[PDB]
Design a protein around this ligand. Sequence first.
Ligand SMILES: *C(=N)[C@H](C[C@@H]1CCNC1=O)NC(=O)[C@@H]1[C@@H]2[C@H](CN1C(=O)[C@@H](NC(=O)C(F)(F)F)C(C)(C)C)C2(C)C
Ligand SMILES: *C(=N)[C@H](C[C@@H]1CCNC1=O)NC(=O)[C@@H]1[C@@H]2[C@H](CN1C(=O)[C@@H](NC(=O)C(F)(F)F)C(C)(C)C)C2(C)C
Lengths: 306, 306
Amino acid sequence: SGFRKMAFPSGKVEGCMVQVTCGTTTLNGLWLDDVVYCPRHVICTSEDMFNPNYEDLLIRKSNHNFLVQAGNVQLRVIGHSMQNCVLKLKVDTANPKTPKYKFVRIQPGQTFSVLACYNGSPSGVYQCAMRPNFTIKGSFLNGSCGSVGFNIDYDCVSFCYMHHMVLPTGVHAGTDLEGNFYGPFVDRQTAQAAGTDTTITVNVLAWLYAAVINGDRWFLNRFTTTLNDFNLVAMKYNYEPLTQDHVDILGPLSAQTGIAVLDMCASLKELLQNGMNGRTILGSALLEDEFTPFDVVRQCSGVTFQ
Amino acid sequence: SGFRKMAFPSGKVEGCMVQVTCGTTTLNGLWLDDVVYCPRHVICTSEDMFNPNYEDLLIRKSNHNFLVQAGNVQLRVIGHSMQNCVLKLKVDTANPKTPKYKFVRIQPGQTFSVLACYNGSPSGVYQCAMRPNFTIKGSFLNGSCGSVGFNIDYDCVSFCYMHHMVLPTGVHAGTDLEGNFYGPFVDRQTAQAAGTDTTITVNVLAWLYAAVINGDRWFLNRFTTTLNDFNLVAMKYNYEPLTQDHVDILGPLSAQTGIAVLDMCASLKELLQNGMNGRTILGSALLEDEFTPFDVVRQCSGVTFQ
Ligand SMILES: *C(=N)[C@H](C[C@@H]1CCNC1=O)NC(=O)[C@@H]1[C@@H]2[C@H](CN1C(=O)[C@@H](NC(=O)C(F)(F)F)C(C)(C)C)C2(C)C
Ligand SMILES: *C(=N)[C@H](C[C@@H]1CCNC1=O)NC(=O)[C@@H]1[C@@H]2[C@H](CN1C(=O)[C@@H](NC(=O)C(F)(F)F)C(C)(C)C)C2(C)C
């Protein structure tokens, strides 16, 4: 009963957040085993930010220059290295709260939870999607860098995002946990803009299945369509092309509801061409594209985590 | 930058969730110090549900009849009692992860985070409001009872909701942690319906301030209004009356933005009378009423928790 934007429980990630200070710059780090991962611009002064030479700035730091705090406890740094846009600080204490974890690089259209943090302390949790233009629509303030995005699978935390910056129009950009940016962005205070975004078609379809499961069925029409003819219509509305891989991922929801994917595609086609006529779907007056097929299955089936 | 529906970090509550089984009925419980709190209908069979005599059903239970599991560890029950609609099971082990906490009864219009759980294991977290008709718009499945709602203030978890049932139209009903229902509902499988709901005016105003803070300002008009004349208009649109207490609670946001509350009221008046004309505010095509003034301040100022 009901359908909500739902984040993963954040406790396993909360137990990994620390504060990292270098000079007067402070941000968040992620403490897993005996390594703290954080954005490399912790080593920048305000003026370094416009054209930083991170390798040069790091040459002039030693271990003791990094103040790492886990709650009230300072963690002694005993080694450091740079990997793309992330700093790795080896500390002399392994985090006893380290969960089973993976570093993953997610694909555009996939979702994750963000644990927004300031000064190593958690503020809140929310769900995001990696947009097709490789930005995310987050909520971040000064000092939020190093906050991470993640998914959970049973007991395993898959970390997929570390926060680095905000772009014009207010969308956000960051890296995977190997320090490689999503998209064509750099960690430098320089003129940068997101490309034009697109609507994540497979997710809109997932959310229409969630509507059917939850009893909101008014938009279901009596037609079908071919994949080619659907994509011709969707392209005009700045929807991303629907692939056979997308069709296959929708299979569980199609099987559960008894509505063929291409039938749902015909109903979406009508919504795009005619609008929703003042009506809502699952309480929204716009079509929602930040629920994946798995998000819908997980919420409508009550999948839990260890 | 950005504005999202944001839940509190759930870790402090995750460390309190357990599974409670009596006979063949299983639901979630909340383990604080040496007491487990859970919905009393854990003691009901399926047929007991329609007209249960909870006092009679509990007479025929003893401590050993309650199987309480915290992960892989069974907790021995050494005492039990009923308080309104909640069962309290004394166990022989105090929860070492008990946070500082309070039991509070919230008022209609206030928000909280829900940690949805199944079989004592967390599934996800989302933000809800206590509706003026004393229901909540949650997302719950079979076995979700005993999931709790809460707010956090620094290090203190204020528990305010325990989940018990779903009503027609799919809205949800439950109790405070003293077992007293919000609203005129009973924990019995009998014909019950929520009263007509109303829109939480002070929260819509809070969210318009959040829009201004985040740069979405198109709806700001050049007028003001009196409190009386605003409430005459709002009443027609099923908005709850705006009180002086509400005006006072909006004061921090008014001071931050330099927009007097009654000026924002004039802009809301225009939105109600004319609509949004295809435009969005903070990405939504409807006016949002499940952010409190404090929710907005907490998100736009980066308040963290210990
Ligand atoms: C990390 N704590 C912050 C997070 C920012 C701050 C406000 N909202 C956020 O998401 N990261 C930064 O301040 C980064 C950082 C230098 C400057 N910066 C920016 O986000 C700037 N953006 C850009 O320069 C642009 F447009 F290219 F993205 C700023 C103008 C300050 C918003 C570095 C190393 C990129
Ligand atoms: C607790 N695990 C469930 C949570 C429900 C289940 C599906 N979605 C939810 O939120 N609680 C119940 O099943 C409660 C419980 C008996 C029956 N019940 C209901 O929610 C029923 N609702 C009502 O009878 C009504 F309309 F009055 F609310 C049901 C028809 C099964 C949905 C008790 C003790 C009320």
